[PDB]
Write a protein that binds this DNA or RNA. Structure first.
Ligand SMILES: [Mg+2]
Ligand SMILES: [Zn+2]
Lengths: 131, 361, 141, 38
RNA sequence: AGCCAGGAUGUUGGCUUAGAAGCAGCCAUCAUUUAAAGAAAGCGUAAUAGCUCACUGGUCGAGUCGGCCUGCGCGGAAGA
């Protein structure tokens, strides 16, 4: 890796994601198998590819560094592997109900996923949001 | 009217001969036998057999499938030409020329396969011709046969190098050795080894008295500088000595022979290229191993390679040619191909006997 | 029932099935009947071009149920058919084959991502061109 | 086990040990790497 | 440094008219998705079932990894 030089550019790209995004939703691949990988890669390359980066750099000085600009309450979601995913084309899109559907498809073991508080909601999966 | 179709007729009948060579029935019978034995559940349990069963398979698949490729291919080329003549499509005339030739290029692929060129048949070789008995009559036949072979390879383009030439006494040699540099040079010459009979009215006796002279020729290849099995020590013997006279423009301007023997089994080779003794003995031991190499291949034929022990030793290809000059009848005793042109085959028109020897060799 | 019991991938041909001769070892070690495997591909290959190289994916269930899935032909052989020159690369940039236009590459990459996965047609084109430069194939636009 | 005056890590799993002063070289992989002395 | 996982799709890997699902020969050595993945570290090999190192995250949450200049020691060191 490198020093702050390379360490910030990944965060700056997250700064580029919070420029116009809303409803960050997260997952947890702490134990993720081959098919848990095969899903999260083949879906990520074919769904949108822009916001579905698995940014699991969830240290309390690394992911907290991702959010000093939009919803600083997201600094609470440091531990228990967290990989943010906002939605760029659709503000508060289907990717809140989709990951819950991903957990209802194959992702049984991802036991730390909650989704972030951009629209001020967590753990309990929701459907009254525009999918 | 199309002479190309007259060649399609010629190639098809030749294809019937190409099928007549390989026993095309038994080709398809044996190929299915390799198939049935691979169904066997112990293919992975018999590893060495599995690589071998695939080897028996792959060697025939390059032949049987090609034989079937020539089958369905020729029937379409039989279609593409007749459709072209009856419809006058200029490109179809142009394409059928390439369609016929490629089948011949497959016949050419079978040509080397029918020749079954293995070990050193695609390599250069050496000649070895010995004179018989009876004074001058034998050495003339040594000469006239050798200088026929020398004029032979020049027409075919093979480079010739007299490794050694030992003149007998009066116009002829007693032994000679010539290097024939060329592609498949051993392949066009291997089958010529044996004794060659000469029958003529001798010019040496008053009156007449048709004399029968004998002389043999031996063709051994180049063994790729090393066989990978060196049987060198083997009671080695060096004898390097001066030769006849270097008179005027005598052979190679060397007169420095290197007589080397291989005492067990009695193999004798010699070299007369250069003055450098260390250079000639290096080159002579190369052909000594090659002459020892042909001895190793004859032993396989002596057991069960290509003799077919049925009643007795089926072979003895010693008398392979008969050259009757005063009757103008050259007969090969291995195929029966005859020719009524002495001076043509004394110039080197030996292709008729090569194909005759290609059949049984 | 469940996911897989015997997972393989075979069939280097498009119209030639032949259970026992080339596939025979990979059938008996996988619990596969020969004629069933001989006809299951024939139950699929009639609609697609035959004689070409098209692979397969086999999954076996615990109740002996064979589900077969076809894939796309490889890059090295389809481009060998797109160029028509049966050659590879003995030496990297010494044994050269022939040129392929990006327009020829565009139809391929859109088809290679039709049976397989990718994100961008040009990114798949670079992957093909990546394998193309790896096969001693000269590539043009 | 192999005995030599000069011992070294031949693999990646083999480690160094100073059993009773005597420098040894245990190995979890092929037992052909067990060394002594050195 | 461990404890948990990925190590994938790529071109089933292409050519010397033997075969190469990360591994005998010759080769490349460009990608895609990229938290990151070399046709590569070792074996199971007719390419048969896989487990791991590269590199990368989660937890614990402090120092640690080697090289160099050198003092004093160990092994190498078995005879009547
Ligand atoms: Mg000391
Ligand atoms: Zn070791």
């Amino acid at each position: 890796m490198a020093l702050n030089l390379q360490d910030k550019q990944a965060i700056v790209a997250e700064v580029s994601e919070v420029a116009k995004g809303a409803l960050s939703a997260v997952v947890a691949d702490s134990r993720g198998v081959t098919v848990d990988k095969m899903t999260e890669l083949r879906k990520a390359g074919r769904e949108a590819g822009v916001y579905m980066r698995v940014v699991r750099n969830t240290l309390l000085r690394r992911a907290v560094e991702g959010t000093p600009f939009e919803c600083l309450k997201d600094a609470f979601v440091g531990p228990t592997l967290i990989a943010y995913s906002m939605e760029h084309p659709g503000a508060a899109a289907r990717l809140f109900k989709e990951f819950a559907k991903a957990n209802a498809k194959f992702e049984v073991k991802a036991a730390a996923f909650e989704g972030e508080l951009i629209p001020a909601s967590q753990i309990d999966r929701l459907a009254t949001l525009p999918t | 009217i199309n002479p190309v179709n007259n060649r399609i007729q010629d190639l098809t009948e030749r294809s019937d001969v190409l099928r007549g060579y390989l026993d095309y029935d038994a080709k398809k019978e044996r190929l299915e036998e390799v198939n049935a034995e691979l169904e066997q559940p112990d293919v992975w349990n018999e590893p060495e057999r599995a690589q071998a069963l695939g080897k028996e398979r792959s060697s025939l698949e390059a032949v049987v499938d090609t034989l079937d490729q020539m089958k369905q291919g020729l029937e379409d080329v039989s279609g593409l030409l007749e459709l072209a003549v009856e419809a006058d499509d200029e490109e179809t005339f142009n394409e059928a020329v390439a369609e016929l030739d490629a089948l011949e290029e497959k016949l050419a692929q079978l040509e080397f396969r029918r020749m079954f060129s293995g070990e050193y048949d695609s390599a250069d070789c050496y000649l070895d011709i010995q004179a018989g008995s009876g004074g001058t009559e034998a050495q003339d036949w040594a000469s006239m046969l050798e200088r026929m072979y020398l004029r032979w390879a020049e027409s075919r383009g093979f480079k010739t190098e007299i490794i050694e030439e030992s003149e007998g006494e009066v116009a002829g040699i007693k032994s000679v050795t010539i290097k024939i540099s060329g592609d498949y040079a051993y392949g066009w010459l291997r089958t010529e080894t044996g004794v060659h009979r000469l029958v003529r009215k001798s010019p040496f006796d008053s009156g007449g008295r048709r004399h029968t002279s004998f002389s043999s020729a031996f063709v051994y290849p180049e063994v790729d500088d090393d066989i990978d099995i060196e049987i060198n020590p083997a009671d080695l013997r060096i004898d390097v000595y001066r030769t006849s006279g270097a008179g005027g423009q005598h052979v190679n301007r060397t007169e420095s022979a290197v007589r080397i023997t291989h005492i067990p089994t009695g193999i004798v080779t010699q070299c007369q290229n250069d003055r450098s003794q260390h250079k000639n003995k290096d080159q002579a031991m190369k052909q000594m191993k090659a002459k020892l190499y042909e001895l190793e291949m004859q032993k396989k034929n002596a057991e069960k390679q290509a003799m077919e022990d049925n009643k007795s030793d089926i072979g003895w290809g010693s008398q392979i040619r008969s050259y009757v000059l005063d009757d103008s009848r050259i007969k090969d005793l291995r195929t029966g191909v005859e020719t009524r042109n002495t001076q043509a085959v004394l110039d080197g028109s030996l292709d008729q006997f090569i194909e005759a020897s290609l059949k049984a060799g | 029932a469940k996911k897989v019991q015997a997972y393989v991938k075979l069939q280097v041909a498009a119209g030639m099935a032949n259970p026992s001769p080339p596939v025979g070892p990979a059938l008996g070690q996988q619990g596969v009947n020969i004629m069933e495997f001989c006809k299951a591909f024939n139950a699929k290959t009639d609609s697609i071009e035959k004689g070409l190289p098209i692979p397969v994916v086999i999954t076996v269930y615990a109740d002996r149920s064979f589900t077969f899935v076809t894939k796309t032909p490889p890059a090295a052989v389809l481009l060998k058919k797109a160029a028509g020159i049966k050659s590879g690369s003995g030496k990297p940039n010494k044994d050269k084959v022939g040129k392929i236009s990006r327009a020829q590459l565009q139809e391929i990459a859109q088809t290679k991502a039709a049976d397989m996965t990718g994100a961008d047609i040009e990114a798949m084109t670079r992957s093909i061109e990546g394998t193309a430069r790896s096969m001693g194939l000269v590539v043009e636009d | 086990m192999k005995v030599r005056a000069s011992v070294k890590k031949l693999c990646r799993n083999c480690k160094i040990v100073k059993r009773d002063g005597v420098i040894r070289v245990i190995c979890s992989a092929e037992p052909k790497h067990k060394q002594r002395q050195g």
